């Protein structure tokens, strides 16, 4: 299931997040902490909801992080090709002159076919040929069916916190202190 945000759910701009601490567990996994502005009773009724939905049934989290969409890398990816067989802390690929710009050292990387997001630690290239090295190491071994991601990364997570998830209301009429703590699964 996605969290909802102001993407999904542009009519409850305060699902917008104030701060996300991205934390580095080292198999590694990520950390998220979010903390939310002060919440009017329909977007806290909203997100309540969706979350009461995720305990309900035992579904995954879905979030986007936007303090990451950079959009450095642009393109369609239907001809970009990353060759079969590698494993480790690099990601070469074959960008068949399709995308435009380049990844910086920092930046989010997933794999289209699998559910794990890694750390873009360097970036070299030699004409179409991108040599992205990667935090942590590969999860899978590539099929060759894969696509990079760059832009628009989900990362699939468990909800921590979920015992202190709430709020009651204020003398403003508005939800305070509500954060989502969760761990890549
Ligand atoms: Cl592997
Ligand atoms: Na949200």
């Known amino acids: 299931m996605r969290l909802p945000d102001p993407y999904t759910n542009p009519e409850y701009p305060g699902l917008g997040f104030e701060s996300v601490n991205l934390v580095d ?3 590694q996994y990520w950390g998220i902490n979010i903390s939310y502005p002060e919440l009017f009773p329909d977007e806290y009724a909203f997100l309540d909801s969706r979350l009461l939905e995720y305990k309900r049934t035992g579904d995954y989290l879905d979030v986007l992080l936007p303090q990451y969409e950079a959009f450095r890398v642009r393109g369609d990816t239907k001809s970009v090709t990353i060759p079969a067989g590698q494993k480790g802390s690099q990601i070469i690929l074959n960008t068949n002159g ?22 873009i630690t360097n970036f070299s290239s ?12 590969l999860f899978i071994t590539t099929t060759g069916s894969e696509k990079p991601v760059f832009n628009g990364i989900l990362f699939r997570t468990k909800l921590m ?6 709020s009651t209301l204020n003398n403003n009429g508005t939800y305070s202190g509500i954060s989502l703590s969760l761990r890549e699964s």
């Open 161 to 166: 916190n979920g015992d202190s998830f709430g």
């Open 126 to 137: 030699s004409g179409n040929v991108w040599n992205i090295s990667l935090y942590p190491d």
């Open 25 to 27: 567990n080292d198999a």
């Open 98 to 119: 399709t995308l435009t710009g380049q990844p910086k050292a920092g930046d989010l990387f997933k794999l289209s076919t699998h559910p794990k997001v890694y750390k």
